[PDB]
Write a protein that holds these residues in place. Structure first.
Motif, PDB file in Angstrom:
ATOM      1  N   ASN A 168      29.958  30.888  18.112  1.00  0.00           N
ATOM      2  CA  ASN A 168      30.452  31.257  19.754  1.00  0.00           C
ATOM      3  C   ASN A 168      29.274  31.054  20.461  1.00  0.00           C
ATOM      4  O   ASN A 168      28.123  31.428  20.124  1.00  0.00           O
ATOM      5  N   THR A 169      29.516  30.311  21.553  1.00  0.00           N
ATOM      6  CA  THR A 169      28.524  29.881  22.406  1.00  0.00           C
ATOM      7  C   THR A 169      28.840  30.315  23.967  1.00  0.00           C
ATOM      8  O   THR A 169      30.065  30.345  24.028  1.00  0.00           O
ATOM      9  N   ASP A 170      27.777  30.611  24.724  1.00  0.00           N
ATOM     10  CA  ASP A 170      28.213  30.719  26.210  1.00  0.00           C
ATOM     11  C   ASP A 170      28.640  29.495  27.019  1.00  0.00           C
ATOM     12  O   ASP A 170      29.563  29.476  27.650  1.00  0.00           O
ATOM     13  N   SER A 171      28.077  28.543  26.613  1.00  0.00           N
ATOM     14  CA  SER A 171      28.073  27.128  27.049  1.00  0.00           C
ATOM     15  C   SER A 171      29.465  26.595  27.036  1.00  0.00           C
ATOM     16  O   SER A 171      30.278  27.302  26.262  1.00  0.00           O
ATOM     17  N   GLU A 172      29.655  25.490  27.802  1.00  0.00           N
ATOM     18  CA  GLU A 172      30.950  24.650  27.674  1.00  0.00           C
ATOM     19  C   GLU A 172      30.850  23.615  26.088  1.00  0.00           C
ATOM     20  O   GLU A 172      32.085  23.579  25.705  1.00  0.00           O
ATOM     21  N   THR A 173      29.843  23.257  25.948  1.00  0.00           N
ATOM     22  CA  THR A 173      29.642  22.571  24.774  1.00  0.00           C
ATOM     23  C   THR A 173      29.855  23.631  23.673  1.00  0.00           C
ATOM     24  O   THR A 173      29.717  24.828  23.504  1.00  0.00           O
TER      25      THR A 173
ATOM     26  N   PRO B 296      33.088  19.836  24.707  1.00  0.00           N
ATOM     27  CA  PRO B 296      34.214  21.009  24.740  1.00  0.00           C
ATOM     28  C   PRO B 296      35.306  20.684  24.045  1.00  0.00           C
ATOM     29  O   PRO B 296      36.031  21.669  23.172  1.00  0.00           O
ATOM     30  N   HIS B 297      36.002  19.778  24.230  1.00  0.00           N
ATOM     31  CA  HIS B 297      37.359  19.531  23.582  1.00  0.00           C
ATOM     32  C   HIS B 297      37.228  18.316  22.583  1.00  0.00           C
ATOM     33  O   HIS B 297      37.939  17.379  22.686  1.00  0.00           O
TER      34      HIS B 297
ATOM     35  N   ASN C 191      25.564  20.718  21.980  1.00  0.00           N
ATOM     36  CA  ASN C 191      26.142  19.923  22.958  1.00  0.00           C
ATOM     37  C   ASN C 191      27.091  19.084  22.569  1.00  0.00           C
ATOM     38  O   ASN C 191      27.509  17.863  22.808  1.00  0.00           O
TER      39      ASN C 191
END
Length: 160
Positions: free
Chosen positions: A115-120, A91-92, A88
């Motif tokens: 590497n994650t699919d979510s934006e977090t 993202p930036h 969590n």
RNA sequence: CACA
């Protein structure tokens, strides 16, 4: 491999059929059977990416029998030592910012992006000592940062 | 977070 899940906070009557349905509806393939104990279960995912997807999709969000499930990496107690995962992450969020939180609890031997699919974002952190990581985990878990709340959990420390 |  970090494909093994712990499924916590289960109800007194959650059965493998119940868990199967949760992971089915969440479109999480599982690679073996659900082993249900007393209030908690275990399952393997096909790989690390799918396990993390189950954690991010289900942990603290999915409610089974009126209880929010915990879905975390299964970590043997004796392997809860230097290593955490942090989920969590905004993202930036610049690494230096994350690092300036990390070093407040010890020496970081390694901080790897996952590497994650979510934006977090997700990172695996290795601290110098068991104590540093426990302080990091207690203090960083729940920390609210740029509209997100950090989740910090042990991952297996097989080399300490 | 598995262990008669």
């Amino acid at each position: 491999s970090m494909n093994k899940l712990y499924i916590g906070n289960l109800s007194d009557h959650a059965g493998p059929a119940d868990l199967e349905s949760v992971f089915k509806d969440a479109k999480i393939p599982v690679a073996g059977p659900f082993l249900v104990k007393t209030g908690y279960a275990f399952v393997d995912c096909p790989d690390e990416g799918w396990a993390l997807k189950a954690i991010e999709a289900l942990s603290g969000k999915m409610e089974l029998h009126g209880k929010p499930m915990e879905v975390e990496h299964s970590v043997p107690k004796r392997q809860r030592i230097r290593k955490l995962q942090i989920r969590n992450i905004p993202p930036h969020l610049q690494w230096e910012v994350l690092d300036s939180l990390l070093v407040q609890y010890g020496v970081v031997e390694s901080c790897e992006q996952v590497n994650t699919d979510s934006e977090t974002a997700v990172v695996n952190v290795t601290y110098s000592s068991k104590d540093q990581a426990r302080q990091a985990l207690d203090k960083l878990n729940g920390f609210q940062l740029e509209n997100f709340t950090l989740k910090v959990a042990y991952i297996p420390d097989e080399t300490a």
